[PDB]
């Protein structure tokens, strides 16, 4: 006969949710990675031979956990910064000496019983006329919904990488397969104590400074045939994109309240021009040709078309940025405008606008005010992914349109955490054999 | 010969307090059920045999911990959203054209600080105090900052299951007619307490548990007149309360965001707040309650008086049903005598009060927003907080008044059957055994 | 030959840093003594026989946590108190009717947030600065919001006990005349430090620990000229201070339940606060300190100077007793010179201050409420913080000056007899032992 026996420290795991903590190489950052445990310079990415694992990035709890942590870190970093509640006053504006508005208003100086007049330049997107009757009085946007909070000028929004590591007794399974579509039995799997440096870069309609595919365009989607589901595309090579803010801004500081400083834009040195981004037309042309070819595999012999968003709020209908403090809003209609078929000076300029009063989380409770950055600022990054949506309300016929989707910041990080999944190891295992305990 | 031997996993415990925590059934509730850990769908209640335990719900420390959690949860629900300190501006009021209401008007700042605005509102007389001569001040703005009760959350007393950390246990007494103290001979153990609704009522226990077969009286010292005498009914007494005033709701923005809500015009005839209770059902209850008191002590006439009097936060029955706090005058109930021998509801006038504290805390105050339209409410009266008046030596009759004046005793009527103990799974005893080398 | 053998419960340790937790001996104190865990019934110190190891008070992280912990407690005791943000209104000052006091008048909003109130108050010139010259402004108003400490909680240096979690222990050096960094004898271990009083002060340690049998001079580097030199006294040099101004406090409510206290009026003639010290005792005590100072380095030319100069917070002697904060001109003490050869009270003029930045924080400003009536106090001077500026060739002479420019070194003089270590009871050693199957 056979008897049951137990074995400790056995290799086996199960899918389960667990808390994750910060980890990063190494004060003045919004993510507060300096008050975090340092990362291990020897990642034990141990390869697991012959194991098969089922991964579903659309169901892991890490993406949702990261979303809450990023929001928590953002709110926490603003708690000690000065509040801009007093700015909600009548704003008398005039045209700049079209996109800017030279405004004058009374401000509460350090002495609470004294008010001082201040001249400032506010973008038209951050100003909304209080009385339509006269375009002279204006009220700051988001003033009738939440209190304005100014970002601390010392801290910066640089997306420094952060490694998400689980406590002891849990492991992160990494999928090494070249071309994991994001859901399936990853053939090439390895175990690592925790993920690599994840850069929390906030973006919309495009993935910046993200990971790149190995040698084939990866199109991942929980339901490629659905319309309400977002389609994430990953490029094999990076498409360099560079922008610039030609307005040579002159930042001026005036103290309001008991020693609390306020930063605003002063006079512009030289000519004033709209913000814009550049991208090689030749590189982007071949990129869409390859992307459309791969996407065509999910619909057979059909043509692919790209449109310029669906319309609505500026927060979701345009690309975003976190360049040195500023927050750009670029009109991507110059890129998602073309047609493709089965068979098939060099730069594209995207008009952009800058808005300081932002939220970047679709929340109506808190309002972010980005202080202006002095002098000309240039921004360069690599395009590694796109957030697409299948636009269709009729028969698929011979063509199908696609637009840069999104409307959910969770999809931004899903494109980077697709390679991982958290599991709980159960070192207890029972199996039978031909031995009996002595007595 | 007898050698000592240690036993592990011994079933023995000792009385001791611990760090209790919540548990509830599956952001918009003041008790924060979403944040609390979900409760087990099948709590494994184990019955015990031959065991007797000494219960003392008065000396119980978990009741005080629950009092802290309720207050802690209250602050955590008011603190996040809008505060109401800017409303300390002077008020100009006059009588309503259509007694208990005043058409108050005052100057206030709109969304933009540079611009002002003149508004009109209808505040209850209890929420307004004179300052002079038609000038008044908002009550409580000379003692604490007002915090408007955030309307996105509801004050519905959803039950919360109270659990204890692992290694401890809660003893649940199931003996019929078991008062607060005594040796329980039907003890049972359970990981967490059953669904307990934290009602904020005072002077009368609403929506609480009921007795098994007869009325039970609880008091650490019934002879002491300064000790509360909690009474529990066997059959509940339905009570219905309503405010016929339609009370339309309006809103104004005081500074950036902070959408303040205030009462508008009263649609229809104005009327006072009141409650209804069946005379026969309530009168019959006092007959048995008085009989129970007579059987315990003072085998003579028993009488009930209309409280002691004082502030409305102490000498009046209050409840939270309907979203607006009520302050009812229970003088119409405790107005009867009981000797040894022995459509039609009783009306109780009530007054609404928006500026409240509900915890006798003079450092904090909260403003309840108005509820549009008429509000319907019904509840089961399962207990009372009686306080026998002992200012004079009893001769032939005793005077009982619905006193209280303490919020801890309100919930003590529900946790009377619980006691937390720490498990001691290690013990020793003698045995004729010898461990070899 | 021999084989390995692992032991448990081994008495070994390593110099490591750990998180300390307070245990205030047995609500009304800034250090939150009522919140700390109860102190031990008695210090369970175990004497370490035959043990001798190195000590280092200038590198241990325990002193750093003491500074940070005290900082957190100070801020934690200020957050629930009233804030004086609306008090930044301009001030119109004039000379007092009866030189360092100014009769300032300003406007403030009463309890109602609509009406203004004109008041008159007395503010010390140190905390009042001009704007151009009849208009003035409060100091630190252009740096941070002024916060008022609750008048019912005092800043008395109540002792607190520092403790280590299980697995960590603090070694206690008990060598008479122990100077510091180096070998120590008569070591002892205890799970919690003795009652240490966080006596906040500058260039003068009040109510500190007296020397065992002789004057002790300690510093991480005596040869270093630009470093602090701490001295411990074996005898207590009693200091007596008093504020003869009969202050009469008055108050107003700047907001709902937000009372503000200020100096209403002074009865009699204004007299600057001062500190007394017996000339004979200080002269003799300071002479002994000079002798030990000469032993370490140099011969003769033991000269003391009147501070360095600059900000008042560092130049003067910080002192607090009864609620008020004092800043005295210590030039009367450190004014002498000696060689190998070798009424009755020294008075130190003092200027009271109300706006202070304890812990030298620009982001926070404290405002001590004025204490009514005459206030007098006494303390024991047990330690001095001295610095030298002998950068030039000290062949003929050099001098010393008071200061420190840091609060961390203040507690270092008290925690000099402690060191935290980590206990790793897992040890190994060879032995003729063989394991069986």
């Amino acid at each position, epitope marked *: 006969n056979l008897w049951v026996t137990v074995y400790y420290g056995v290799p086996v795991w199960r899918d389960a949710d667990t808390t994750l903590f910060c980890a990063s190489d190494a004060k003045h950052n919004v993510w507060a990675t300096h008050a975090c445990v340092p990362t291990d310079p020897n990642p034990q990415e141990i390869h697991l031979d012959n194991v098969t694992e089922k991964f579903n990035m659309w169901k892991n709890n890490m993406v949702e956990q990261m979303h809450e942590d990023i929001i928590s870190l953002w709110d926490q970093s603003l708690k000690p910064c000065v509040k801009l*509640t*007093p700015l909600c006053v*009548t704003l*008398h504006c005039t045209n700049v000496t079209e996109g800017l508005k030279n405004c004058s208003f009374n401000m*509460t100086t350090e002495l*609470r*019983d004294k*008010r001082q007049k201040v001249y400032s330049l506010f973008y038209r997107l951050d100003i909304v006329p*209080i*009385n339509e*009757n*006269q375009g*002279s*009085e204006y009220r700051l946007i988001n003033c009738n919904t939440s209190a304005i909070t100014q970002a601390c000028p010392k801290v910066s929004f640089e997306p420094i990488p952060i490694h998400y590591c689980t406590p002891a007794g849990f492991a992160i399974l990494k999928c090494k397969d070249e071309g994991f579509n994001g859901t399936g039995l990853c053939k090439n799997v390895s175990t690592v104590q925790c993920t690599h440096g994840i850069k929390p870069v906030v973006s919309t309609q495009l993935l910046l400074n993200g990971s790149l595919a190995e040698k084939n365009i990866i199109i991942r989607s929980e339901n490629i045939t659905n319309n309400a589901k977002i389609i994430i595309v990953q490029l094999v090579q990076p498409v360099t994109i560079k922008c610039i803010r030609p307005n040579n801004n002159t930042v001026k500081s005036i103290r*309001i*309240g008991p020693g609390q400083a306020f930063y605003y834009t002063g006079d512009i040195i030289g000519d004033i021009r709209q913000a814009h981004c550049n991208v090689t037309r030749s590189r982007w042309n071949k990129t869409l040709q390859e992307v459309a070819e791969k996407l065509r595999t999910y619909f057979g012999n059909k043509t692919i078309i790209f449109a310029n968003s669906s319309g609505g709020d500026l927060e979701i209908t345009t690309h975003s940025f976190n360049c040195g403090g500023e927050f750009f809003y670029c009109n991507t209609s110059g890129l998602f405008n073309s047609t493709w078929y089965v068979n098939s000076n060099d730069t594209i300029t995207l008009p952009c606008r800058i808005k300081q009063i932002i939220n970047m989380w679709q929340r109506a409770g808190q309002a972010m005010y980005a202080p202006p950055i002095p002098g000309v600022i240039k921004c360069e990054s690599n395009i590694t992914g796109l957030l697409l949506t299948r636009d269709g309300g009729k028969d698929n016929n011979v063509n199908e349109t696609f637009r840069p989707g999104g409307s959910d910041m969770r999809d931004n990080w899903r494109s980077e955490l697709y390679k991982y999944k958290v599991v709980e190891i159960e070192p207890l295992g029972v199996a039978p054999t031909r031995c009996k305990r002595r007595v | 010969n007898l050698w000592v031997t240690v036993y592990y996993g011994v079933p023995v415990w000792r009385d001791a307090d611990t760090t209790l925590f919540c548990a509830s059934d599956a952001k918009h509730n003041v008790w924060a059920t979403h944040a609390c850990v979900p409760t087990d769908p099948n709590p494994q209640e184990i019955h015990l045999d031959n065991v007797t335990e000494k219960f003392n719900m008065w000396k119980n420390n978990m009741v005080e911990q629950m009092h802290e959690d309720i207050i802690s949860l209250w602050d955590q629900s008011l603190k996040p959203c809008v505060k109401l300190t*800017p409303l300390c*501006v002077t008020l100009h009021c006059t009588n309503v054209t259509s007694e208990g209401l005043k058409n108050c008007s005052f*100057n206030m*700042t709109t969304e933009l*600080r*540079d*611009k*002002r605005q*003149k508004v009109y509102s209808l505040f209850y007389r209890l929420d307004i105090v004179p300052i002079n001569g038609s000038e008044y001040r908002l009550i409580n703005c000379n003692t604490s900052a007002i915090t408007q009760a955030c309307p996105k959350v509801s004050f519905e007393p959803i039950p919360i299951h109270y659990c204890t950390p692992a290694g401890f246990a809660i003893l649940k007494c199931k003996d019929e007619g078991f008062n607060g103290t005594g040796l329980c001979k039907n003890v049972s153990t359970v990981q967490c307490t059953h669904g307990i609704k934290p009602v904020v009522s005072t002077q009368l226990l609403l929506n609480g548990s009921l007795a098994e077969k007869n009325i039970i009286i609880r008091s650490e010292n019934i002879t002491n007149n300064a000790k509360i005498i909690i009474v529990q009914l066997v059959q509940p007494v339905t009570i219905k309360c309503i405010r016929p005033n339609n009370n339309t709701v309006k809103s104004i923005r005081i*500074g950036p965001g902070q959408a303040f809500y205030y009462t508008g015009d009263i649609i229809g005839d104005i009327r006072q707040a009141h409650c209804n209770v069946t005379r026969s059902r309530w009168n019959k209850t006092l007959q048995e309650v008085a009989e129970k008191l007579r059987t315990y002590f003072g085998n003579k006439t028993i009488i009930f008086a209309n409280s002691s009097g004082g502030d409305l936060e102490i000498t009046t029955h209050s409840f939270n049903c309907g979203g607006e706090f009520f302050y009812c005058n229970t003088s119409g109930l405790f107005n009867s005598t009981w000797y040894v021998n022995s459509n039609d509801t009783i009306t109780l006038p009530c007054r609404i009060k928006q500026i409240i504290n509900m915890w006798q805390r003079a450092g904090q105050a909260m403003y309840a927003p108005p509820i549009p339209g008429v509000i319907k409410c019904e509840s089961n009266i399962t207990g009372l907080l009686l306080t026998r008046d002992g200012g004079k030596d009893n001769n032939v009759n005793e005077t009982f008044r619905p006193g209280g004046s303490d919020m801890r005793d309100n919930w003590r009527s529900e946790l009377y059957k619980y006691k937390v103990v720490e498990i001691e799974p290690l013990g020793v005893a003698p045995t004729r055994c010898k461990r070899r080398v | 030959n021999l084989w390995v053998t692992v032991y448990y419960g081994v008495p070994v340790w390593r110099d490591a840093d750990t998180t300390l937790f307070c245990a205030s001996d047995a609500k009304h104190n800034v250090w939150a003594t009522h919140a700390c865990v109860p102190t031990d019934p008695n210090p369970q110190e175990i004497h370490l026989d035959n043990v001798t190891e190195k000590f280092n008070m200038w590198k241990n992280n325990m002193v750093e946590q003491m500074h940070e912990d005290i900082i957190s407690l100070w801020d934690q005791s200020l957050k629930p108190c009233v804030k004086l*943000t*609306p008090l930044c*209104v301009t001030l119109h000052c004039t000379n007092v009717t009866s030189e360092g006091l100014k009769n300032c008048s300003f406007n403030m*909003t009463t309890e109602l*947030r*609509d*009406k*203004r109130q004109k008041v008159y108050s007395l503010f010390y010139r140190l905390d009042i600065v001009p704007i151009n010259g009849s208009e003035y402004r409060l100091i630190n108003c252009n740096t941070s919001a002024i916060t008022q400490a609750c008048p019912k909680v005092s800043f008395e240096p109540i002792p607190i006990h520092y403790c280590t979690p299980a697995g960590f222990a603090i070694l206690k050096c008990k060598d008479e005349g122990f100077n510091g960094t180096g070998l120590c004898k008569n070591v002892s271990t205890v799970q919690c430090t003795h009652g240490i009083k966080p006596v906040v002060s500058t260039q003068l340690l009040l109510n500190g620990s007296l020397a065992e049998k002789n004057i002790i001079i300690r510093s991480e580097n005596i040869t270093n000229n630009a470093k602090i030199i701490i001295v411990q006294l074996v005898q207590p040099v009693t200091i007596k201070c008093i504020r003869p101004n009969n202050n009469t406090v008055k108050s107003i409510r700047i907001g709902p339940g937000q009372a503000f206290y200020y100096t209403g009026d002074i009865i009699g003639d204004i007299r600057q606060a001062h500190c007394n010290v017996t000339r004979s005792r200080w002269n003799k005590t300071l002479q002994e300190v000079a002798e030990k100072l000469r032993t370490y380095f140099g011969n003769k030319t033991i000269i003391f100077a009147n501070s360095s100069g600059g900000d008042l917070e560092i130049t003067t002697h910080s002192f607090n007793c009864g609620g008020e904060f004092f800043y005295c001109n210590t030039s009367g003490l450190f004014n002498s010179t000696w060689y190998v050869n070798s009424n009755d009270t020294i008075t130190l003029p003092c200027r009271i201050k109300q706006i202070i930045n304890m812990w030298q924080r620009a982001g926070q400003a404290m405002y001590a409420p004025p204490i009514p009536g005459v206030i007098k106090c006494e303390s024991n001077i047990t330690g001095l913080l001295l610095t030298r500026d002998g950068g030039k060739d000290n062949n003929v002479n050099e001098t010393f000056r008071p200061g420190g420019s840091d609060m961390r070194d203040n507690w270092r003089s008290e925690l000099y007899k402690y060191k935290v270590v980590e206990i790793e009871p897992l040890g190994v050693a060879p032995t003729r032992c063989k394991r069986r199957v």
Partner: antibody
Amino acid sequence: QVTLKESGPALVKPTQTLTLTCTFSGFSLSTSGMAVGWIRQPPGKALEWLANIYWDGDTYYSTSLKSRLTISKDTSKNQVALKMTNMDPVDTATYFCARGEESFYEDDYGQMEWLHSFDAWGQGLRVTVSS
Amino acid sequence: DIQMTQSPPSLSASIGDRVTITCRASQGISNYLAWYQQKPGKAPKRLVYDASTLQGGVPSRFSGSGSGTYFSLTISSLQPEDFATYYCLQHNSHPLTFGGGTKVDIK
């Protein structure tokens, strides 16, 4: 019922100094906010503000008349007087004494002050400049 | 200086006809503006303050509108007692200033 009553010399010689004074009964000018001012209207011309005095004694005058206008209040007898020098022929007009109002607010961040339009006006008196 | 203006300075109306006048400012003066009625050779009287709140006791025939920099007084129906001069005053900040006046003539 509040009422204003102004008085002064009906005729004044040129280049001389004159004083006007108006009485009030409905207010005492000390109820934290009450103000009072003077306005003038030439024959057939538009109105013209002259000066305003508030409860706290604060005075405000017109930009063109700041060099020859003065306003004072006598709260002990409920009176407000205006003094004007350098009488010129164009100054002949009908002078009115009207009560104004002022309000304050304190939203923690900073003090806010608001003015109000005149509500009550006096009967008025005509001043003629003749040689 | 906060200069004020108003148009039409003089107009001709008819009995029972609706008529309105406008007042413009040199800059934004919020809604701190009021209007006054003045009979020929009489003390002025206020009829609307804050540009929207009708003065108590005055009939509902008059009404105010506008804000920021463009204000206006509307009269739904004229009556013979309307023979008077209307003035627009601003009280946003000192110095106070009156409008140019508007005379009405009934045909």
